């Protein structure tokens, strides 16, 4: 209707922000940013709902406007800034560090990380082309272009990004024998290393994946994003380890064993 939509209601926003139906009509529309609208998570949502630091929007703004907190080690003062997958949220509150990584149920958990891990992040290369004056370049899932890459780095691979500098510290190739995370959709927040790839002419390369318990499954390659070598993940994984328990194991562990 005659241009961009600036407002956004509750309900229209995704289920994995854990937005309660009541206590408001509207939701925070994520601002135009690196990540997409539906996949990403606003900073306000990360603060008041998850971490429980702020109560109101006021308080959130008052926290953000005094610098302190920063995504990618950069000021980032806007309220509804889209913090997406695999982002370092550096805070000065008792030297606390946070990595956004997916959970069992496809949400963003409060997963703390070490001060050494805060240095670097990862990124799935979406295209690699020549820019102006024949200079090749890559582009990650979060738009962080890197000039003068290694010729080994082709499409669908992962890059380790240094944050402090826009550089390629490492790269990992796309095949079996590597630890392989999976985002997007039904099998969102799982790990199973790849068994084998499938070509399919005319788009959509369904990859076959096999977790630690050998409960194999298939997902689409656009939502697949690797991580590291077998038994050597370059990022510290959360509780659950990208396995996904059935409802039986849930009723055994999460409402029987854990009780006092």
């Amino acid at each position: 209707a005659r241009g961009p939509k600036k407002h956004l209601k509750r309900l229209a926003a995704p289920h994995h922000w854990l937005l309660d139906k009541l206590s408001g009509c509207y939701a925070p529309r994520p601002s135009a940013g690196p990540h997409k609208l539906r996949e990403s998570l606003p900073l306000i949502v990360f603060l008041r709902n998850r971490l429980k630091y702020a109560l109101n929007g006021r308080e959130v703004k008052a926290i953000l406007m005094q610098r302190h907190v920063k995504v990618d080690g950069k000021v980032r003062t806007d309220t509804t800034y889209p913090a997406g997958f695999m982002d370092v949220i550096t805070l000065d509150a008792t030297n606390e560090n946070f990595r956004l990584v997916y959970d069992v149920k496809g949400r963003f958990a409060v997963h703390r990380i070490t001060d050494e891990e805060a240095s670097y992040k990862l990124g799935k290369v979406k295209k690699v082309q020549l820019g102006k004056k024949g200079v090749p370049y890559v582009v990650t899932h979060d738009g962080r272009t890197i000039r003068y890459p290694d010729p080994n780095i082709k499409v669908n691979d992962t890059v380790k990004i240094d944050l402090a500098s826009g550089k390629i510290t490492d790269f990992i190739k796309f095949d079996a024998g590597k630890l392989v995370y999976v985002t997007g959709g039904r099998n969102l927040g799982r790990i199973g290393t790849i068994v084998h790839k499938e070509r399919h002419d005319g788009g959509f390369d369904l990859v076959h994946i096999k977790d630690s318990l050998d409960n194999t499954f298939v997902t689409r390659l656009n939502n697949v994003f690797v991580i590291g070598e077998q038994g050597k993940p370059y990022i510290s994984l959360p509780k659950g380890k990208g396995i996904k328990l059935s409802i039986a194991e849930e009723r055994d562990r999460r409402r029987a064993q854990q009780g006092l």
């Binding site: 630091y53 702020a54 006021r58 308080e59 005094q66 302190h68 907190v69 000065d92 509150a93 008792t94």
Partner: protein, 132 residues
């Protein structure tokens, strides 16, 4: 009054706002309601920061009686409390004083009148004076 017994459950320290945030639970048999002012007087026994520096807000009584739940804050210094706490709570605490000005629709009417005048508007008055 009997027992009283303040219990600050679900304690979170908040370095980024310079405060602590917590759930005040109170056991008050043989008295009607809890009273915020009395809790402000007696919360300094555990934390020690006078009264206005601390703050609190947020309560509700349990069904039946004898008990009250609530959600509250404790800021470290007074200045921080002044700058971070919402403006309306300060009035309740007696620190700030809200300028009780005109009605909302009245202000809107004023705004419309100001829209209807171009520039400063003293020129119009002067023109009228020359006219008569």
């Amino acid at each position: 009054s009997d027992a009283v017994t303040i219990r600050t459950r679900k304690v979170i320290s908040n370095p980024l706002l310079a405060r602590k945030q917590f759930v005040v639970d109170v056991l008050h048999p043989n008295r009607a309601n809890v009273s915020k002012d009395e809790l402000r007087e007696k919360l300094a026994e555990v934390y020690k920061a006078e009264k206005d520096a601390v703050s609190v807000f947020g309560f509700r009584t349990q069904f039946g009686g004898g008990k009250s739940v609530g959600f509250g804050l404790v800021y470290n210094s007074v200045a921080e409390a002044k700058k971070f706490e919402p403006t309306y709570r300060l009035v309740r605490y007696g620190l700030a004083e809200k300028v009780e000005k005109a009605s909302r629709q009245q202000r809107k009417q004023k705004k419309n009148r100001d829209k209807k005048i171009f520039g400063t508007g003293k020129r119009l008055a002067k023109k009228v004076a020359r006219r008569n």
